[PDB]
Amino acid sequence: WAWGGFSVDNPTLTRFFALHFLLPFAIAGITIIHLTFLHESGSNNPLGISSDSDK
Amino acid sequence: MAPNIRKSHPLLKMINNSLIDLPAPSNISAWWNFGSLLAVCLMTQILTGLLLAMHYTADTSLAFSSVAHTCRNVQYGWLIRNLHANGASFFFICIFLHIGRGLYYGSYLYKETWNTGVILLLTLMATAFVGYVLPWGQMSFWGATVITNLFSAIPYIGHTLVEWAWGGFSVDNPTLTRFFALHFLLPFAIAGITIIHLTFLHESGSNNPLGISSDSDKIPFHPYYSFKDILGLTLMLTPFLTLALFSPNLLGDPENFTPANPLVTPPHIKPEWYFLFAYAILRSIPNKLGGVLALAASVLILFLIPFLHKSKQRTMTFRPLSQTLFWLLVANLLILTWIGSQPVEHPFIIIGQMASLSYFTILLILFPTIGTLENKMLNY
Amino acid sequence: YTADTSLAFSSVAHTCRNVQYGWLIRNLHANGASFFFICIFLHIGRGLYYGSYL
Amino acid sequence: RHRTQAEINQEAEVDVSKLRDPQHDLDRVKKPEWVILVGVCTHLGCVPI
Amino acid sequence: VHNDVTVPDFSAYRREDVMDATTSSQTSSEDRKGFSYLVTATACVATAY
Amino acid sequence: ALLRQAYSALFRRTSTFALTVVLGAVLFERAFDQGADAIFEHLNEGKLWKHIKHKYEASEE
Amino acid sequence: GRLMDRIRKWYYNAAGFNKYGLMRDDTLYEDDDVKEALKRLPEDLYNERMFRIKRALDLSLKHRILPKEQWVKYEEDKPYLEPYLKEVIRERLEREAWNKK
Amino acid sequence: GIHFGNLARVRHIITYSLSPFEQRAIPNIFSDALPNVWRRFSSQVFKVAPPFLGAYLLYSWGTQEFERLKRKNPADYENDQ
Amino acid sequence: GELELHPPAFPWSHGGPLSALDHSSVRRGFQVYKQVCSACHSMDYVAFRNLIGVTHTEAEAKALAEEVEVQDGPDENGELFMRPGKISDYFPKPYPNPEAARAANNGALPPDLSYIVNARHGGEDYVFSLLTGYCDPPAGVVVREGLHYNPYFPGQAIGMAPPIYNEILEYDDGTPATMSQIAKDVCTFLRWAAEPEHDQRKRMGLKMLLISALLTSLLYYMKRHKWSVLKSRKMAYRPPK
Ligand code: HEC
Ligand code: HEM
Numbered sequence A: 001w002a003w004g005g006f007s008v009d010n011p012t013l014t015r016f017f018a019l020h021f022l023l024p025f026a027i028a029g030i031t032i033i034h035l036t037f038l039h040e041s042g043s044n045n046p047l048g049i050s051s052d053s054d055k
Numbered sequence B: 001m002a003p004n005i006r007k008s009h010p011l012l013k014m015i016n017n018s019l020i021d022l023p024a025p026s027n028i029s030a031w032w033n034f035g036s037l038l039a040v041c042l043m044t045q046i047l048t049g050l051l052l053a054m055h056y057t058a059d060t061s062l063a064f065s066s067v068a069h070t071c072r073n074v075q076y077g078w079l080i081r082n083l084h085a086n087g088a089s090f091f092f093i094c095i096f097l098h099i100g101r102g103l104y105y106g107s108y109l110y111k112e113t114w115n116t117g118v119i120l121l122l123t124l125m126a127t128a129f130v131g132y133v134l135p136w137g138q139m140s141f142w143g144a145t146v147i148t149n150l151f152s153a154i155p156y157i158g159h160t161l162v163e164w165a166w167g168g169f170s171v172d173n174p175t176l177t178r179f180f181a182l183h184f185l186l187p188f189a190i191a192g193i194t195i196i197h198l199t200f201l202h203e204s205g206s207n208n209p210l211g212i213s214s215d216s217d218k219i220p221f222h223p224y225y226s227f228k229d230i231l232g233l234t235l236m237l238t239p240f241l242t243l244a245l246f247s248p249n250l251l252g253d254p255e256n257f258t259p260a261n262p263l264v265t266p267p268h269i270k271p272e273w274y275f276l277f278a279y280a281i282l283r284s285i286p287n288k289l290g291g292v293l294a295l296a297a298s299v300l301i302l303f304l305i306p307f308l309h310k311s312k313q314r315t316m317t318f319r320p321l322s323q324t325l326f327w328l329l330v331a332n333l334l335i336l337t338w339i340g341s342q343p344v345e346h347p348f349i350i351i352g353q354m355a356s357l358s359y360f361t362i363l364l365i366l367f368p369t370i371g372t373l374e375n376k377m378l379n380y
Numbered sequence C: 001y002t003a004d005t006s007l008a009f010s011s012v013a014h015t016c017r018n019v020q021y022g023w024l025i026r027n028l029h030a031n032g033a034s035f036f037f038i039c040i041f042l043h044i045g046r047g048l049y050y051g052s053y054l
Numbered sequence D: 001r002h003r004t005q006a007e008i009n010q011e012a013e014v015d016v017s018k019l020r021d022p023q024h025d026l027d028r029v030k031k032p033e034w035v036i037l038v039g040v041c042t043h044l045g046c047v048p049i
Numbered sequence E: 001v002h003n004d005v006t007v008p009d010f011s012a013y014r015r016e017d018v019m020d021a022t023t024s025s026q027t028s029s030e031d032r033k034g035f036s037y038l039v040t041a042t043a044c045v046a047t048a049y
Numbered sequence F: 001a002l003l004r005q006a007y008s009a010l011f012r013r014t015s016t017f018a019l020t021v022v023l024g025a026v027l028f029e030r031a032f033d034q035g036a037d038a039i040f041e042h043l044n045e046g047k048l049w050k051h052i053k054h055k056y057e058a059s060e061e
Numbered sequence G: 001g002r003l004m005d006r007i008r009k010w011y012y013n014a015a016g017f018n019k020y021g022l023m024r025d026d027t028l029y030e031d032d033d034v035k036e037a038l039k040r041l042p043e044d045l046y047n048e049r050m051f052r053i054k055r056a057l058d059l060s061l062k063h064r065i066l067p068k069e070q071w072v073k074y075e076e077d078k079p080y081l082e083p084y085l086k087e088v089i090r091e092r093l094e095r096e097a098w099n100k101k
Numbered sequence H: 001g002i003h004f005g006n007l008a009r010v011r012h013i014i015t016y017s018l019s020p021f022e023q024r025a026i027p028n029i030f031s032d033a034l035p036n037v038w039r040r041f042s043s044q045v046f047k048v049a050p051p052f053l054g055a056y057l058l059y060s061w062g063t064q065e066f067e068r069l070k071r072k073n074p075a076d077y078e079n080d081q
Numbered sequence I: 001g002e003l004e005l006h007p008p009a010f011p012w013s014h015g016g017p018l019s020a021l022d023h024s025s026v027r028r029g030f031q032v033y034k035q036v037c038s039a040c041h042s043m044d045y046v047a048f049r050n051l052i053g054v055t056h057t058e059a060e061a062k063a064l065a066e067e068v069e070v071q072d073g074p075d076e077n078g079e080l081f082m083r084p085g086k087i088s089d090y091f092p093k094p095y096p097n098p099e100a101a102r103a104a105n106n107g108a109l110p111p112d113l114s115y116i117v118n119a120r121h122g123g124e125d126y127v128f129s130l131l132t133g134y135c136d137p138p139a140g141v142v143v144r145e146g147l148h149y150n151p152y153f154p155g156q157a158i159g160m161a162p163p164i165y166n167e168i169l170e171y172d173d174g175t176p177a178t179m180s181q182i183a184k185d186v187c188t189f190l191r192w193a194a195e196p197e198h199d200q201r202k203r204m205g206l207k208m209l210l211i212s213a214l215l216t217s218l219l220y221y222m223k224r225h226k227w228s229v230l231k232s233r234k235m236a237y238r239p240p241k
């Protein structure tokens, strides 16, 4: 199914191009989610102790 | 913190504040349905577009045939192609009604929402243009030639920009491959800007048909509008599918079933229905550069609408004079559409210039004038 | 680029040989991918070490 | 294009300089019978029949 | 005062089975709901299809 | 009391409502396809390969 | 003669906001000036305005209008906000004029 | 995002509503619905229709006029020999 | 100068929204193409396999393809060779390139027929009218040598001599091979060639319509149901003393 045939061939190539063009944008989108969850707490720091007293 | 996840969770919180607990006017009509329909076309176009992209080949020697291969060999390839081709039209029908609603009800007074809205129209148009080139039929080629050559009208840099855009001395293979990339990309810029559109909108929430504050009567988006919108979806989905399944080519030029021939120009080069009115305007001014400006203005005029509001009332609901003026405008657009599909010859040429002229007149002069006149009849 | 098994390889060659700075853009893209993985591995390491995964 | 007799005199006959781009029919020619052009309309790039 | 307040009359809208004020509305409730929910379940079927 | 019985047995619990929609879709599909496929073929008697087939389906030489 | 008056009365009826029971002033677009004026309305005038509007929005969603006997009459339309609105604009222009050196 | 609760200042308004299950979904079709559809239609036909009628005429004319100019004018060959 | 004759609308048995193509007519049409038009017209997008289960059995289709010689290779010496056709082969081109084609037709180029009914206004109506519409030019009109008069063709001077006449072939199904019968059939075949999904498309349209009617109604009710709460809602203004 993934191949679009009985082996890696042209239908595999064209669909891989589309996927390659698309995924980077899913990455960009998900990065926003990544940073959105992060800001709920802000960054951690090398000492692993609360930095609210020094931001 | 919050007793229910729908409100505390950083992601659900968002879905909840824009699609579940979002406060909406209790009285918004069917003209408020096109926003969500537009969003659904967007997602629909993207889905079918990727499916087609997965069997397409951007090379002037393989484009036309890869599309044929798609429609003739790919399982349901023909179906997906119809849905994508006709989906583009449902998209424009919806965007025109969305704009119309906005003009009638003074939604444009929400300036940022309106302005991003105009950007969305421009982006959708570029998308359709670069998308329409891909099958590489006669109409694809020549229309792409007429349009790209418009830019050569710009003084000094014109010729330079055009050849730059083309990647050569005329519409050719490098034009095709870059158009494919653009067509693949833009829909996502449209999706992104839609978020901005909706973000500005939520600063104030929706307007309503009476143009008076609805804070005294709001209702949760769900289930009132979620249900109302799904209904609207299936009502507009019937014509779409009927057209798509019973008259696949009703709206297309037969000339595009003929591989692009750089040496033969079709007798009658006419654009897709949704660009006809603009074409009519382009031709009204027999001067190359004057026509380009006229065309530019025909769409950029939309940015000016918010500054031409003179009425003391937001909508045209209680403004009978403006209402007549509004339908004249709509009919005027009908005439331009019609004129844009005819050849440049009497009586069309004159009818065309009239319509073009009255188009700009109604928007730039009559509307604000009548608006003022109406305020006085109310003794304001 | 052209996604067809008969033109892929050569369109990339055409890019690196004929497109202005085509070769440059291709290097940057090809090596950029490596730079990307170098950075993601360090990003992850940092996370594991400092218990960011919490 | 290979011009005849009505493609050479009919030309030098209609006003020497009275067109968008004022030029004489014998201006763009190395031979009256031979006229070589780029069949692209200087408007929006279409082709003249 | 609130005593002077009464719910208006919704006869022009009530479903047939709850029209009469002297009849328990609970006896027709399962039918009234079953019907409405039947429509919904059917829409889900068509939609799933 | 179908509406009543239907309500209590299928539509009351959200769980049973879901199973009812699944089996409903299954039964609906089978019946709808066959019915539609019939209506179509009937409106086109004698035109489909289904109809012509027998003539060449191993009949000569 | 009564031309202007004739015209105004025609428009009033042609506009039709009176079919929802709304006063002319209930239909004003709430720009900055109007918002400020509303804040100066006396409690009762404000609560009455609110009911009329909530009621009209209800009519709007129902796609109905009021029975012809409840339509406001051109001569009974009460310009309850105009006086305030005028003062507001009068004050704003004063500030504006004064802030121009 | 969050707005319910801080929208407007309202006083002295009572509203009454019935569950969806206690009422008809599409009630009084003939005594109310249709009569109103007619009302609505009527009150807008002479605002809308007119300009579209005008466009329709202009269309008809221009179309006919275009075809008329394709026809032969007998008076161009009366004295032809 | 701008005059043109537009074809009338014929009642094709596949014109209705739920009307499939008459496969017998399509099979006959194929014969007309194979024995007459294919001498000058290519049909680049149709392969013998496409016939199977539509107009011919797999055996018939295989035979049809083997009647043709196709070029293949290169072989072990880097040589091109000929071989019998396969159902996976597409219909043979009558000429190597358009230059050769024109060269064999007085400079006129017979267009590929794969999408001809979709690349011409009027579709089969136009193709039928053209095939059966040749006639002598009207007074005052002179066709140049090599061209033929046909009022349906734009300009009226076509470079294709009438391709069909009575009994120009014999339908092996016994149908009386009259010119109009032939045109009718080949046009039906052309419609098929252009849109092989024709029939399936219409079967789907049928279901689309039914499901849609049903679904639209169910959703209309649900929308009305939920909204009843607001639609019948009543209110009053009870200000104090
Ligand atoms: C001897 C070669 C020959 C045969 C046989 C022939 N054609 Fe053609 N056909 C042509 C040529 C040449 C043209 C070019 C006409 C022109 O453009 O002036 C043409 C053009 C056409 C066109 C339309 C061109 C247009 O622009 O509208 C169609 C349709 C067509 N043929 C159909 C048929 C069909 C179907 C048959 C068989 C029943 C057939 N032809 C058999 C030579 C032929
Ligand atoms: C395209 C991939 C990624 C991008 C663009 C990205 C981006 C970011 C950014 C901008 C930050 C904030 C600055 C910093 O601390 O470095 C961050 C933080 C973080 N990321 Fe990622 N990240 C990516 C992948 C990952 C991966 C693979 C993991 C772990 C499996 C991860 C885990 C985290 C965590 C836990 C933090 C918290 C940092 C802290 O301790 O304060 N990230 N990331």
Ligand code: HEM
Residues within 6 Å of the ligand: B031, B032, B033, B034, B035, B036, B038, B039, B042, B095, B098, B099, B102, B105, B106, B107, B108, B110, B113, B114, B116, B117, B118, B120, B121, B124, B190, B194, B197, B198, B201, B205, B206, B207, B208, B302
């Ligand atoms: C891809 C294009 C677009 C999408 C997806 C889109 C989507 C939406 C959505 C979801 C809404 C809310 C629902 C509604 O009122 O319809 C909305 C509202 C609005 N949009 Fe768009 N829109 C688009 C284009 C435009 C254009 C072209 C304009 C104007 C030039 C525009 C102007 C507005 C305005 C002003 C509103 C306010 C509606 C109100 O009066 O409450 N939109 N749009």
Ligand code: HEM
Residues within 6 Å of the ligand: B042, B045, B046, B047, B048, B049, B050, B051, B052, B053, B054, B056, B067, B081, B084, B085, B088, B091, B124, B127, B128, B129, B131, B132, B133, B134, B135, B183, B184, B187, B190
């Ligand atoms: C705003 C969304 C979109 C619009 C308005 C749109 C419009 C169009 C148009 C007008 C066509 C030509 C149809 C024809 O052949 O007559 C087209 C072709 C095409 N579109 Fe889109 N498109 C959209 C999004 C996409 C996306 C997201 C992709 C792929 C990721 C895509 C891929 C294609 C492909 C591959 C074709 C060429 C094949 C064909 O013409 O059938 N489109 N599109």
Ligand SMILES: CSC1=N[C@@](C)(c2ccccc2)C(=O)N1Nc1ccccc1
Residues within 6 Å of the ligand: B125, B126, B128, B129, B130, B132, B133, B139, B140, B141, B142, B143, B144, B146, B147, B269, B270, B271, B272, B273, B275
């Ligand atoms: C690539 S050609 C093209 N792209 C379309 C879809 C378009 C043009 C402009 C804006 C949006 C979409 C269109 O109508 N044409 N055709 C065409 C034919 C003749 C003259 C101009 C355009």
Ligand SMILES: CCCCCCCCO[C@@H]1O[C@H](CO)[C@@H](O)[C@H](O)[C@H]1O
Residues within 6 Å of the ligand: F048, F049, I021, I053, I054, I192, I195, I196, I197, I198, I199, I200, I203
């Ligand atoms: C237009 C020529 C049609 C020949 C096939 C006749 C069968 C039409 O019918 C349809 O065909 C599709 C693909 O073959 C199937 O996927 C559908 O299930 C079937 O109903």
